[PDB]
Amino acid sequence: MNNTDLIHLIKHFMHNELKAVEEVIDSPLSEFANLIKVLQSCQGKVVFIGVGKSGIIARKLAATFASTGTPSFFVHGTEAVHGDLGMVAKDDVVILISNSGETAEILATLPSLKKMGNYLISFTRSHHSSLAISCDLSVEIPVKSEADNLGLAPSCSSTVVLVVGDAVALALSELKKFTRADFGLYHP
Amino acid sequence: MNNTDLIHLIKHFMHNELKAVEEVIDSPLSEFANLIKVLQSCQGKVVFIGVGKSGIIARKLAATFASTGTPSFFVHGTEAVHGDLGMVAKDDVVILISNSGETAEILATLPSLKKMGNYLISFTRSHHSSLAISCDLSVEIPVKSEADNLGLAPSCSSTVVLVVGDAVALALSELKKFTRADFGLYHP
Amino acid sequence: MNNTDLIHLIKHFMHNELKAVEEVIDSPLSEFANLIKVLQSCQGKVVFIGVGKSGIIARKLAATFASTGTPSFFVHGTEAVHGDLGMVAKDDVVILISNSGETAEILATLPSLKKMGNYLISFTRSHHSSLAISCDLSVEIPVKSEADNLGLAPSCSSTVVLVVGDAVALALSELKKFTRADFGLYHP
Amino acid sequence: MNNTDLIHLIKHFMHNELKAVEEVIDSPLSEFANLIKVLQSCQGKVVFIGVGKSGIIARKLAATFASTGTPSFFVHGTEAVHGDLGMVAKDDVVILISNSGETAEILATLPSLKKMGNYLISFTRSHHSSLAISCDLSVEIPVKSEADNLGLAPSCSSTVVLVVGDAVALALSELKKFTRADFGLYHP
């Protein structure tokens, strides 16, 4: 493939990700106002749980939340059922990330988290998913297709969740009057 | 803040990220053809090195490369200088991610990596940065501003690097004729 | 080297680690009673901070604490100064692990943690170290030599810290009357 | 509990870990000579796979191997079946760590790894375990009991695996004539 065609191939995949993000910005985002309220009410930490590519995005979001004034950390969904559920305490709010909302590792956390009683938020592509139905607050972040020809590799979905989560973090930060000095305290 | 204003605030941050991605898709991406060639020539693993938010994106990109047929793994930039440079062997190609190209932890890897002799690629916002000048192939991914009012929190920059890296992965994958069956082997 | 000599070489390194652990069990452990008291008083999470090999042991200890009824999580020492200090909130107690007590990344956390006001505990080989002197409670875990001929590779030191930390976790667990049913809740 | 009794309680758990290590040093370690030979023959990377507490020890061992001259990295057992199996290439040797040798996440890697053809080594408590029987080389590291009263928390088992793995790393390092200068290259 010549250089101009290689460049056009790269831009094609980028453009597929851009379109997925546009789709979300153009949607009503009705449950987001409730999402902000629940997160503002959190007296503990916002605990993000995920596995696979969603799990790496969940790690970035926990870091971004914390660095911008919303105490947060990540628990890997497998490690959760090997003891790390002990990291979650009564005042913590839990955000579980799964694009399908069927990921077996994430569903496996739910019987314990129901017993523990924490408020559960899901980020998935469908309010009808198993995970979304089991949570207290389902946030639907629809994603039509992944960027590859067979639609198999998380690319549109992981990017959309990252953009949505970053914006939620920055809104919480602005609303709580987080300052340059507070940013400097955590990033010296 | 009422519900419609909270929603508009969230969409504002999302839109700032969208614009940064658009800026990159609209640019020439001249060095990308060379980037693809170097990565296709790799007989070892593509080793991604980063710290902070770039480092979490570098972890996602290594996973995406591997899952789509380009053997790759992540080495945290601090851990690298505590021994993990031993993970990098002669045939490995190294991609070092730093938005400023001045991150002290990333620069600290360079005297050893020069002695080790591996081909070094940087992803930074400026060909003039310290990191870009020390690498064999500098890839410039400019980012005008972060999405927050003070421009302090990686949001536009981490998202742009993610989109660019995903597209590079998917192009390498398509070019090497990676199949549904190969995807299934690594994702059973 | 023949098989019997290879086996004796492996046992030699194992034996060097065993001796370092014995040295600690034979010591007074005077400050451990105070350590238990501080950890029992924690109303938040026990936050472990480390980098390099100490950092991986710190990750294991945070998991072991949590799985046995003491809410705890790990913050990497570099990531801490890139924003993750925002994970630590007023009621959290911090354990910083550094064998020398001079590790630059760990010392770099201290000006912010002093401003944030949390009670700081160090695990180091010397009460005279920079880290130990800056903390509220210094726990000295002396280690004479690493297991390799040049004494360079953390082996005796990382193992000793692991054994000491596991025992502290299991004592807190027994003292708080942690049950089989609670273990099952976090490990379903 | 008074101070002298708290100290004796801590030393009791430490002593339980010490005894488990002694049990192993006193055993024949027959398959270790073969283990060294296979690891010396590796032309690629030694890839450690684990989850839970074994997985954190597997992360420490990969780092220790690399820092002492045996290129190695860690792949989490869950992430492996979400794509990270793509990190393992034909010349890589795989060490899978599971104390029971029945851990579901670790067994789930095996159909793909059999198709991929890599030489598989297991570290488990029993040659009869599912994992041990599926591997090319089973290394049995027996552990009678964990250190807690109910024998539930990995403590003796994770410590024994750490000591055994450190010694294997240091033996490979000595045998290949790894130097102070090479240590300094990876740890500058």
PDB file of C-alpha atoms in Angstrom, chain A residues 59-184:
ATOM      1  CA  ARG A  59      -8.354   2.601  35.529  1.00  0.00           C
ATOM      2  CA  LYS A  60      -7.865   5.884  33.569  1.00  0.00           C
ATOM      3  CA  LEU A  61     -11.270   7.214  34.778  1.00  0.00           C
ATOM      4  CA  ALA A  62     -10.565   6.438  38.435  1.00  0.00           C
ATOM      5  CA  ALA A  63      -7.232   8.329  38.107  1.00  0.00           C
ATOM      6  CA  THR A  64      -8.899  11.291  36.345  1.00  0.00           C
ATOM      7  CA  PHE A  65     -11.682  11.466  38.958  1.00  0.00           C
ATOM      8  CA  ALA A  66      -9.128  11.484  41.818  1.00  0.00           C
ATOM      9  CA  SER A  67      -6.761  14.008  40.205  1.00  0.00           C
ATOM     10  CA  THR A  68      -9.710  16.400  39.729  1.00  0.00           C
ATOM     11  CA  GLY A  69     -11.105  16.191  43.267  1.00  0.00           C
ATOM     12  CA  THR A  70     -13.419  13.144  43.387  1.00  0.00           C
ATOM     13  CA  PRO A  71     -11.685  10.431  45.507  1.00  0.00           C
ATOM     14  CA  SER A  72     -11.798   7.245  43.369  1.00  0.00           C
ATOM     15  CA  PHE A  73      -9.800   4.071  42.695  1.00  0.00           C
ATOM     16  CA  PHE A  74      -9.977   0.994  40.438  1.00  0.00           C
ATOM     17  CA  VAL A  75     -10.699  -2.653  41.376  1.00  0.00           C
ATOM     18  CA  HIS A  76     -10.192  -5.218  38.644  1.00  0.00           C
ATOM     19  CA  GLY A  77     -13.352  -7.355  38.221  1.00  0.00           C
ATOM     20  CA  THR A  78     -11.508 -10.687  38.636  1.00  0.00           C
ATOM     21  CA  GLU A  79      -9.437  -9.514  41.574  1.00  0.00           C
ATOM     22  CA  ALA A  80     -12.754  -8.318  43.187  1.00  0.00           C
ATOM     23  CA  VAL A  81     -13.967 -11.958  43.523  1.00  0.00           C
ATOM     24  CA  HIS A  82     -10.496 -13.020  44.814  1.00  0.00           C
ATOM     25  CA  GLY A  83     -10.799 -10.777  47.864  1.00  0.00           C
ATOM     26  CA  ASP A  84     -10.588  -7.219  46.539  1.00  0.00           C
ATOM     27  CA  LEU A  85     -14.334  -6.727  47.189  1.00  0.00           C
ATOM     28  CA  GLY A  86     -12.958  -6.048  50.717  1.00  0.00           C
ATOM     29  CA  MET A  87     -11.684  -2.728  49.355  1.00  0.00           C
ATOM     30  CA  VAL A  88     -15.289  -1.421  48.985  1.00  0.00           C
ATOM     31  CA  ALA A  89     -16.774  -0.027  52.231  1.00  0.00           C
ATOM     32  CA  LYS A  90     -20.341   1.132  53.118  1.00  0.00           C
ATOM     33  CA  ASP A  91     -20.092   4.808  51.906  1.00  0.00           C
ATOM     34  CA  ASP A  92     -18.395   3.876  48.569  1.00  0.00           C
ATOM     35  CA  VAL A  93     -20.354   4.147  45.288  1.00  0.00           C
ATOM     36  CA  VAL A  94     -19.487   1.551  42.574  1.00  0.00           C
ATOM     37  CA  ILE A  95     -19.365   2.124  38.812  1.00  0.00           C
ATOM     38  CA  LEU A  96     -19.191  -1.148  36.863  1.00  0.00           C
ATOM     39  CA  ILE A  97     -18.129  -0.783  33.205  1.00  0.00           C
ATOM     40  CA  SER A  98     -19.072  -3.428  30.569  1.00  0.00           C
ATOM     41  CA  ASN A  99     -19.898  -2.575  26.948  1.00  0.00           C
ATOM     42  CA  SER A 100     -22.164  -5.605  26.425  1.00  0.00           C
ATOM     43  CA  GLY A 101     -23.402  -5.552  30.080  1.00  0.00           C
ATOM     44  CA  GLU A 102     -23.001  -9.370  29.951  1.00  0.00           C
ATOM     45  CA  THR A 103     -19.314  -9.754  30.825  1.00  0.00           C
ATOM     46  CA  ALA A 104     -19.174 -12.840  33.031  1.00  0.00           C
ATOM     47  CA  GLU A 105     -16.458 -11.487  35.396  1.00  0.00           C
ATOM     48  CA  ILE A 106     -18.469  -8.325  36.038  1.00  0.00           C
ATOM     49  CA  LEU A 107     -21.764 -10.183  36.656  1.00  0.00           C
ATOM     50  CA  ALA A 108     -19.888 -12.465  39.165  1.00  0.00           C
ATOM     51  CA  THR A 109     -19.313  -9.447  41.454  1.00  0.00           C
ATOM     52  CA  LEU A 110     -22.989  -8.709  41.809  1.00  0.00           C
ATOM     53  CA  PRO A 111     -24.274 -11.230  44.415  1.00  0.00           C
ATOM     54  CA  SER A 112     -21.628  -9.952  46.937  1.00  0.00           C
ATOM     55  CA  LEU A 113     -22.140  -6.276  46.063  1.00  0.00           C
ATOM     56  CA  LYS A 114     -25.931  -6.745  46.645  1.00  0.00           C
ATOM     57  CA  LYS A 115     -25.193  -8.181  50.110  1.00  0.00           C
ATOM     58  CA  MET A 116     -22.710  -5.347  50.818  1.00  0.00           C
ATOM     59  CA  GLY A 117     -25.470  -2.788  49.913  1.00  0.00           C
ATOM     60  CA  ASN A 118     -23.510  -0.201  47.993  1.00  0.00           C
ATOM     61  CA  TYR A 119     -25.200   1.981  45.356  1.00  0.00           C
ATOM     62  CA  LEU A 120     -24.286   0.430  41.951  1.00  0.00           C
ATOM     63  CA  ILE A 121     -23.989   2.353  38.683  1.00  0.00           C
ATOM     64  CA  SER A 122     -23.454   0.643  35.313  1.00  0.00           C
ATOM     65  CA  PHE A 123     -21.974   2.036  32.079  1.00  0.00           C
ATOM     66  CA  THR A 124     -23.134  -0.316  29.289  1.00  0.00           C
ATOM     67  CA  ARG A 125     -24.485  -0.131  25.728  1.00  0.00           C
ATOM     68  CA  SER A 126     -28.070  -1.185  26.797  1.00  0.00           C
ATOM     69  CA  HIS A 127     -30.426  -0.587  29.673  1.00  0.00           C
ATOM     70  CA  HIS A 128     -31.703  -4.186  28.950  1.00  0.00           C
ATOM     71  CA  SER A 129     -28.363  -5.829  29.705  1.00  0.00           C
ATOM     72  CA  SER A 130     -27.974  -8.142  32.763  1.00  0.00           C
ATOM     73  CA  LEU A 131     -25.618  -5.693  34.417  1.00  0.00           C
ATOM     74  CA  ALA A 132     -27.774  -2.622  33.770  1.00  0.00           C
ATOM     75  CA  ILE A 133     -30.872  -4.384  35.193  1.00  0.00           C
ATOM     76  CA  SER A 134     -28.979  -5.378  38.357  1.00  0.00           C
ATOM     77  CA  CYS A 135     -27.668  -1.911  39.089  1.00  0.00           C
ATOM     78  CA  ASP A 136     -29.343   0.997  40.906  1.00  0.00           C
ATOM     79  CA  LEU A 137     -28.589   3.467  38.111  1.00  0.00           C
ATOM     80  CA  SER A 138     -28.097   2.288  34.533  1.00  0.00           C
ATOM     81  CA  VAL A 139     -26.269   4.730  32.213  1.00  0.00           C
ATOM     82  CA  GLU A 140     -26.683   3.705  28.580  1.00  0.00           C
ATOM     83  CA  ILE A 141     -23.795   4.622  26.275  1.00  0.00           C
ATOM     84  CA  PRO A 142     -24.821   3.053  22.943  1.00  0.00           C
ATOM     85  CA  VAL A 143     -22.114   2.091  20.475  1.00  0.00           C
ATOM     86  CA  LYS A 144     -23.326   0.800  17.033  1.00  0.00           C
ATOM     87  CA  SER A 145     -20.113  -0.850  15.792  1.00  0.00           C
ATOM     88  CA  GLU A 146     -16.377  -1.202  16.657  1.00  0.00           C
ATOM     89  CA  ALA A 147     -13.902   0.467  14.241  1.00  0.00           C
ATOM     90  CA  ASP A 148     -12.451  -2.752  12.643  1.00  0.00           C
ATOM     91  CA  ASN A 149     -14.060  -4.506   9.601  1.00  0.00           C
ATOM     92  CA  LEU A 150     -15.410  -7.409  11.716  1.00  0.00           C
ATOM     93  CA  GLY A 151     -16.464  -5.132  14.610  1.00  0.00           C
ATOM     94  CA  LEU A 152     -14.531  -7.252  17.130  1.00  0.00           C
ATOM     95  CA  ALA A 153     -11.880  -4.991  18.708  1.00  0.00           C
ATOM     96  CA  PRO A 154     -12.940  -2.457  21.434  1.00  0.00           C
ATOM     97  CA  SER A 155     -12.044   0.881  19.821  1.00  0.00           C
ATOM     98  CA  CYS A 156     -15.250   2.907  19.330  1.00  0.00           C
ATOM     99  CA  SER A 157     -16.652   1.537  22.635  1.00  0.00           C
ATOM    100  CA  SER A 158     -13.536   2.120  24.821  1.00  0.00           C
ATOM    101  CA  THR A 159     -13.054   5.617  23.347  1.00  0.00           C
ATOM    102  CA  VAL A 160     -16.670   6.625  23.856  1.00  0.00           C
ATOM    103  CA  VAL A 161     -16.593   5.494  27.533  1.00  0.00           C
ATOM    104  CA  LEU A 162     -13.359   7.404  28.056  1.00  0.00           C
ATOM    105  CA  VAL A 163     -14.797  10.642  26.633  1.00  0.00           C
ATOM    106  CA  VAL A 164     -18.059  10.283  28.592  1.00  0.00           C
ATOM    107  CA  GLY A 165     -16.207   9.508  31.869  1.00  0.00           C
ATOM    108  CA  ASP A 166     -13.681  12.363  31.427  1.00  0.00           C
ATOM    109  CA  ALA A 167     -16.608  14.809  30.953  1.00  0.00           C
ATOM    110  CA  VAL A 168     -18.409  13.495  34.059  1.00  0.00           C
ATOM    111  CA  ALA A 169     -15.135  13.946  36.042  1.00  0.00           C
ATOM    112  CA  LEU A 170     -14.594  17.503  34.745  1.00  0.00           C
ATOM    113  CA  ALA A 171     -18.214  18.484  35.446  1.00  0.00           C
ATOM    114  CA  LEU A 172     -18.000  17.164  39.087  1.00  0.00           C
ATOM    115  CA  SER A 173     -14.699  19.048  39.404  1.00  0.00           C
ATOM    116  CA  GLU A 174     -16.109  22.369  38.131  1.00  0.00           C
ATOM    117  CA  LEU A 175     -19.263  21.979  40.246  1.00  0.00           C
ATOM    118  CA  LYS A 176     -17.298  21.451  43.478  1.00  0.00           C
ATOM    119  CA  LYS A 177     -15.009  24.454  42.768  1.00  0.00           C
ATOM    120  CA  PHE A 178     -11.827  22.419  42.492  1.00  0.00           C
ATOM    121  CA  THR A 179      -8.854  24.866  42.185  1.00  0.00           C
ATOM    122  CA  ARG A 180      -5.408  25.211  40.523  1.00  0.00           C
ATOM    123  CA  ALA A 181      -3.891  24.948  44.042  1.00  0.00           C
ATOM    124  CA  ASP A 182      -5.787  21.597  44.714  1.00  0.00           C
ATOM    125  CA  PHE A 183      -4.590  20.292  41.293  1.00  0.00           C
ATOM    126  CA  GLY A 184      -1.014  21.224  42.319  1.00  0.00           C
TER     127      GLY A 184
END
